[model samples]
Target chain A: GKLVLAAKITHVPSMYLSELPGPHQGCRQAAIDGHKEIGQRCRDLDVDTIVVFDSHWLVNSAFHINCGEHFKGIYTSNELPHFIKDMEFEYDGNPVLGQLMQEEIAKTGVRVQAHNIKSLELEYGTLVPMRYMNQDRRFKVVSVSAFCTSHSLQDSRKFGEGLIKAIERYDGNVAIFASGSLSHRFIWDWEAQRGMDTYTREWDRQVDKHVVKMWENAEWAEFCAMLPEYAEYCFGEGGMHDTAMLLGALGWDKYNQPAEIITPAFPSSGTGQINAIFPLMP
Target chain B: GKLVLAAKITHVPSMYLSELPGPHQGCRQAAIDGHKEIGQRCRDLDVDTIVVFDSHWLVNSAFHINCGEHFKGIYTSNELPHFIKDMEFEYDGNPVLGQLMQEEIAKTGVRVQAHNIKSLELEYGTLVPMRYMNQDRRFKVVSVSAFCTSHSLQDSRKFGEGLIKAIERYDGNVAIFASGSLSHRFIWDWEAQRGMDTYTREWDRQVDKHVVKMWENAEWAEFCAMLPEYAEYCFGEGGMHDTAMLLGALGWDKYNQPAEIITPAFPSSGTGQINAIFPLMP
Candidate 1:
């Protein structure tokens, strides 16, 4: 049992709209294909489960994990209803992996609770990827809430480190995903339609392009140093905990392996989005 | 300080649709008016604050209280998205009353926790009521999680009992609301559209009507004895904990004050809904 792959991926709700018969059909082709490609990579690497840090599932007070015996729900976006509605999702759950991760993460002095609560519906971040990646039911899902209202980056890093320890300690091969975007300042209501397929600000896009370049060049220390300020200025999704978790699991600011591009960076509804894989080799 | 009012009310998302400019607009006028009447009642009684047992917010662990100094969020329904989307809400919060309720409730060994965490958004159960009742931001809010996946009626009864004691110890007149419904089994997807305005089962609605009759007649023992069967057979909303909590605060099966109906019981989206007050007489 070992880490197979790790990625920071886009889960914009627009991707959900692409699958259906509508005016926007196939609009998110690049994002859809990116998720499918990542799914294939995990299959090729013999991954047994996929764990997602889902930023859309906001939680306050503490980090939480959803590891029910099975997952099935119909979801609609509270943040963006026009993007998705009545989306049905189904998948298996890996409670063995979920509980173990909770235990290991808590050992890092940050408490994380794992439970099988019904009607605790899956958020868009996890569901959008599952639509393209696990529709065939090939992999089990373990979702962790990354949109923590009362936690810090320090806690996320430790939680990520603890998560990897649990993965290595368990009897399964795993692929972990930080399912979020970069620079997520939503467009204003009056002018939102004008920026449907573009970034809200050229300023935000310029900063994100540089950040992506740093990601590809294995400049983890530089990126990590600027992460705090970048997160604040860019309206980082889930306060960039998803980003921190992926880096945290990979030795935080020390890992220098170049990230491979899966889907080249793009802008949608004002946010920066991409699919990029971080190396799992230690 | 004293308890000015206590109620078990409906918070169907359709009421939100009732206020807009479309086919469903004005469809739920009766429900809206009931809420308005309650608002007027609170204003007339000089109630200082409103505490809501929000059953729509699902919590898997211990009881939780949302007592932020202020509550403001844009909300849409995750359970029934077509009924609400990107609806704006703003209201001041009563941390003093919230913290006081938490402390006093914990004295009953229930371990209720209170916090003012950011982005700890309000659910539709609170927001739907706030739409009609607190549009002017006249009353401060204190929301409690009533959808407990890992709790029992015994605990909710204790939680409710503890809350009343807290109200008595505080320095202002207050209203406690159990915001939920009766007989809540949603329609099957195949026939969901057909039953848009019908109860899922006639047997369930009959039982709900009987229960309402019992409430009006002060048949506490009869209703309390039948609650378990009614909840299970009728598929009670929030496991009927809102019902139990209201009754719990009213002395379980002992209090015998006549119930006053604010809104007549009606079927919507396969559930029974109403606005009714349970007296707070000691």
Candidate 2:
């Protein structure tokens, strides 16, 4: 199986608007540009399916893979509906691949279940990334949750390993989208003098810079070591479990693999936002 | 703060149509009658909210509590859409109590999250029970999931204790609905013979007989012991996690408490179904 693209995309809704932007325009534009680059690379790679994991749709006991045949819905964010309201989206679901992925992952001693409920809606974590990607809803989507319970790093990585194996057996090109933040502590105010704290912004960027360097050099050991400290400071749910899963899917052996950074990490209301595209290597 | 009723109800769709008078009419009537009894008791007690836990809507990692302000949707089951096509339901959700329950449960080291998404629909487990109860959608509902992961009997009981505490804080009457089966293994053949197997029927009744006896005598120790062996052969997602939670909510120290069994154990497509009602004692 050919792994087409693997990347981490931010899912902050405030960054959805970069055009005709005023305050925080630079940061918004960076995120918009990031999504645009991801779209371009997806087109270039001719990706068929996008397997995504979101931190918001938390499940308990077993992993839930959204294998709905048709995913069509209008999402109004519960947390920040003012920023992202009445957004409509529709996409095809790859139930067959989802089934295969579930079976493969279950053997790793992790319980996996596939759900195809028609009314199942998408959360902001998955929706925001797809919106920024400028996805026309043509590519099939298979969404999974980052469980809220004690799903450790080892467990996530094991899941990714199973995912890689499943992709190998599949025929078409596949893409992996890990949608989350780097430093996800929220302390932003529109009326504030600077909109966000300078220290938090600096911290976010510093972590991103180090992570990118580690990833580019394939220093996974060092990168993994930084996770606990980074997670404590960032305070992201699951400590950016999506990214861990993506790295796991890429296989630690290929840690030194080359990839282009379409969007370096930027600050969004104190959250870190970035997108990096990894092309398939022969 | 009074708990008006605590009971187990069947959610099998086939049993929902017992009033139509078909084959297995007597078995179906028993279940239908059981729900009617629950309906009358709920009305008599004037309950304001009903907290329910279902086996069908399995989750992983953390317990999910539906806290939507207004729950309105048409649910067509992914498993048996033909039997339950486009069934519409709407009810008010007790978000305030749901949030309190989550916080209290979390303090016990059990992760609980409140979900208020409008697109999140109810399953047959919750819907079927409500249907036979002759509910008019007047009482508020808080639906939770039975996790498929390592949520042990103790954990579920802890959640129940938290729920009881939440109900005590509220200023109205409450009820508990555990929608599940005793021996849930399925074996059906609609052609060339009877629809279900004889051996499965024998096994279902034997387990039910023992469970009903344990409940009547409040033999919690023996009942809890039976779960492991019963669960292996019977195959419930949480191995009767709902029952454990209900018993937990009732507080185990008050074991040997008096309760009425409205419906004796009966078969619905080879699975054991029963309805037991426990009235709160001063």
Query: What tens-digit string does per-residue lDDT give for candidate 2 at A99-133?
Result: 88888887887656777677665556777767756
**lDDT, residue B259, candidate 1:** 87
lDDT of each: 0.80, 0.69
Candidate 2, residues B35-109, lDDT tens digits: the string is 887978888889888888887665433567776778776765433332444567777788888888888887877
| Interface root-mean-square deviation, candidate 1 | 18.6
TM-score of the B chain in model 1?
0.96
Question: Deviation in angstroms for A137 in model 2?
Answer: 3.5
Question: Per-candidate TM vs. native?
Answer: 0.55, 0.56
**Model 1 off-target regions past 4 Å?**
A1-40, A43-282
Clashes of each: 0, 8
